[PDB]
Amino acid sequence: ADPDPMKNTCKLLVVADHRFYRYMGRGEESTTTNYLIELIDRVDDIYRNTAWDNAGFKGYGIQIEQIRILKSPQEVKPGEKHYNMAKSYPNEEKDAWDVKMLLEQFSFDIAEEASKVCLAHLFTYQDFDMGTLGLAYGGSPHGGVCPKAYYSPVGKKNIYLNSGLTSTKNYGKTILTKEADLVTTHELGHNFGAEHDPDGLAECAPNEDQGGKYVMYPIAVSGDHENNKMFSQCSKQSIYKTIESKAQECFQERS
Ligand SMILES: COc1ccc2[nH]n(C[C@@]3(C)NC(=O)NC3=O)c(=O)c2c1
């Protein structure tokens, strides 16, 4: 397979919710956007430099098309929910939403905009239970790159599963930027078709002395080991097949 430079970039709709704006953006558009621009660019370096077939099938990456900045909580009617509402759901007494329900709600609310982009990604600031940092569709044992309709019987409309989310809060504190970059890499990894690296394949889950785990390992990589910022051969095989199938459908030229 040969790369098409006219169809080698997955353009993103990046959404910063009110929690992200307040806690990460310090209530400023400049601070909020600079954080996301720099994070996406560092993630793009991991992707763009990856040779998916271990040869010349490289130069595939991600770029931001738009950053939506939600400065305040979404006003909701009684019984109505929205990913950007003030309260956490299902438990308002908790700092965070149930992560799966949040990804579902974001996908529902962002459906119209998501239909026009390769991927939509939510950046929030909430302490998900049991150390979870993000969630995404694709590479699950459907969804991922390029909007694919799913009729929601509950929602009564089509939603698109080209979505993921990252939280930069864990255990009551802001995560390191080196940690945040890896969360987003991991979530987009799922979007790109990669499943978790299994323990049973040494090639895909190396020991610490061997450079450590790759980004798709199910236990969040810290970023202090060499392999942490890279995709395993297992992830490359899965993503290679996805890119081959999906680039013509929704990838665009690098800006
Ligand atoms: C480096 O970031 C990572 C790496 C592994 C992770 N595992 N999890 C939990 C969960 C449900 N989310 C996800 O995308 N994969 C999963 O198993 C992170 O939230 C996570 C984040």
Ligand SMILES: [Zn+2]
């Ligand atoms: Zn995962």
